[PDB]
Design a protein around this ligand. Structure first.
Ligand code: HEC
Length: 104
């Protein structure tokens, strides 16, 4: 994926609810640092729905590709109010950005 294109997507569609940096604040949504290779619902200090807390999957490229297409379909009951990114290539670019920015 294209990290620069992914950053733009993140800024436009995600940043208002999410920070990525280590120690970043929670906003409407949880800070995302450390997301890759961890189960759903594990950001310290964030109050998740039971739906996100108990989804029982590990985040990675494949599960983020599915989730970001349509969050409510993957996690019914989620309080992330976002319809999804419909284009597969845009999801891949965003995910490549996230794999860098949430791991720095
Ligand atoms: C505010 C309106 C949001 C927007 C825009 C985005 N997200 Fe979000 N996200 C939000 C909330 C409130 C939550 C918790 C939902 C719950 O039911 O408890 C989330 C959750 C996620 C997660 C899961 C995190 C985890 O399990 O630890 C991910 C991976 C995620 N959000 C990513 C993400 C992306 C990449 C966004 C832009 C496309 C995006 N979110 C937008 C709130 C909001």
């Amino acid at each position: 994926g294209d990290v620069e294109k992914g950053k733009k997507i993140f800024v436009q569609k995600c940043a208002q609810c999410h920070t990525v940096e280590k120690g970043g604040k929670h906003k409407t949504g949880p800070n995302l640092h450390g997301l890759f290779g961890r189960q759903t619902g594990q950001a310290a200090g964030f109050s998740y729905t039971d739906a996100n807390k108990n989804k029982g999957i590990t985040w990675g490229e494949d599960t983020l590709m599915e989730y970001l297409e349509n969050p409510k379909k993957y996690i019914p009951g989620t309080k992330m109010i976002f319809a999804g990114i419909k284009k597969k290539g845009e999801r891949a670019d965003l995910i490549a950005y996230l794999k860098k920015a949430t791991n720095e």
